[PDB]
Amino acid sequence: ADKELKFLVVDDFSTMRRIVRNLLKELGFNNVEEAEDGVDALNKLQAGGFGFIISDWNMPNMDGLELLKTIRADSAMSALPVLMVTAEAKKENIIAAAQAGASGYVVKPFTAATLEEKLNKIFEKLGM
Amino acid sequence: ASQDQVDDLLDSLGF
Ligand code: BEF
Ligand SMILES: [Mg+2]
């Protein structure tokens, strides 16, 4: 199984990036970089090689919904999987994220099992 | 929404 899949973990909260990085490590993914908002994320992404994004919503500089739309509109990365992991849990917002092309959606607080389950589901949808 | 509510919502959107 491909464990070199390179993840970008985006969240303004250091503890949450640490949680997500540690969980990915458990799953066998050691190629993980971090960003603190959408602007930071877009800079990291131009270094190449990223195969998967896990992103927060509420962040300064550029929020996760803006980030997601930007990625979906870029020919350099239009179909790049983006898992939302966020405290944002209003039905309207979840629908909006989905319509904006989110690959999946996890509400905080979440268990290790939930993250693994949602990542697996995305892999399956894409033939990964 | 709980995670179960999110999953139900996204299932109804075709995920
Ligand atoms: F700030 Be994230 F949306 F939890
Ligand atoms: Mg945040």
- Within 10 A of A12 (CB to CB), how many other CB atoms are there? 18
Tokens of A95: 């629908």
> Binding residue per annotation — A74?
no
Are A94 and B6 in contact (CB < 8 Å)? yes
Are B6 and A110 in contact (CB < 8 Å)? no
Nearest 5°: the CA angle A104, A109, A110 is 55
CA dist., res. A11 & res. A4, Å (int): 22
Structure obtained using:
X-ray
CB A103 within 8 A of CB B14: no
| Resolution of the experimental structure, in angstroms | 2.0
Residue A107 at interface with chain B, using a CB cutoff of 8 Å: yes
Match 């066998």 to its residue by tokens: A28
Element (H, E) at A8: strand A6-10
3-state secondary structure of A19: helix
Four-residue CA torsion sign, A112, A115, A118, A119:
negative
Structural domains present in chain A? 1-128 (3.40.50.2300)
Alpha helices in A11-111, H assignment, sequence order: 14-27, 38-45, 64-73, 91-99
